[model samples]
Target: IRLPIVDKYKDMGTVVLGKLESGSICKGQQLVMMPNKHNVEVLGILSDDVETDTVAPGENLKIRLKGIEEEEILPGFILCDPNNLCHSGRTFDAQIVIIEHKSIICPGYNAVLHIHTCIEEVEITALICLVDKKSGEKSKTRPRFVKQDQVCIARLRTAGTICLETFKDFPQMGRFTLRDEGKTIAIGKVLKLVP
Candidate 1:
């Protein structure tokens, strides 16, 4: 696990909070934040942060920082051990549903997707198959008529690079909420990010 910087603030100096996800951390250790490259030194790691001097990986913690402006670090950024930096990038793969049977045909379409803080341009270039969730069978063909209950493994493309994790690992970054002209048009769970 990596210490994904959740949020930052200014209390006395500049305070940041997130779960310590990597190796054991102790007070006075310095950190290197990524995507928004900012250097910071750990001042007082507190709260149930640790009973004393060190923290063993999985705890919700807070620390006072001495470098970078509070507004400069975003929630999506990471404040990790200088020696261990994180990586990123992904594909637009998901099991999205068509709202109706009449909407059976929807590939080669383009729409807007909302993951969380970022909005990237999306294009549905192909459909892998249909999931007959009702019958528990695979409908891999492009049948003219499809049930409203069926789900499709639609493949999508993006104009630019966006970083994300696998759905099973981090649903918060893998879930997608899509929309069209008027309102919420479709929804989906990221099945794979194999690019």
Candidate 2:
């Protein structure tokens, strides 16, 4: 993902953060920082680091965004080149890619906490279409019904109180799936600039 970002913004490379993505990060992994995303350089996690452990099925994690300030970030958001991918807090317009077969309601008024992120229940949103995801791969899903368990991707209606970095710049922060009745439904990725 970071490679693609670097490639697309090669000219704007100075403004890009070298973020690597994979299911590699684990508890207690040592993190190192990179430059640009913040006024100062930030740390990142190394690929070779070992996984301390995985979060339990019902674990609640409160990971912190070191170096970056909350005043500069927000929930359900990703920032790139000084711009954000979240809704402006009032009216959010985004392309929603439905990865499921059923009609999943928008977060529904107020909002719900997804991972460490928070998103507004879409007031008025549209479903683009059903994509042929799953790539024909199937796995026995866990027997659970929770927001985090569902897969969802979205652009918020407003800039949250915190700076939401793109999963590209901050894979540790960005990326999410929506849950309906404890099952995965939709999933999304956030780029710093407009998609």
Candidate that would win on lDDT: 1
Whole-model lDDT values for every prediction: 0.65, 0.34
State the lDDT of candidate 2 residue by residue for 121-178, as single tens digits: 3221322222223552222442122232243333454323333445555555455444
Cα deviation in Å at residue 139, candidate 2? 28
lDDT of 1: 0.65
Q: Per-residue lDDT for 1-195 in model 1, tens only?
A: 346566777787887777675567767777776665677777777746344567777687776777765567666565656664544454657877656334554566677776544466677777777777777466757644334556777677766545555577666556676666645566777777656
Candidate that would win on TM-score = 1
Off by over 4 Å in 1: 1-87, 100-105, 142-149
- Candidate 2, run of 10 with poorest lDDT: 1-10
Per-prediction TM-score, please? 0.59, 0.32
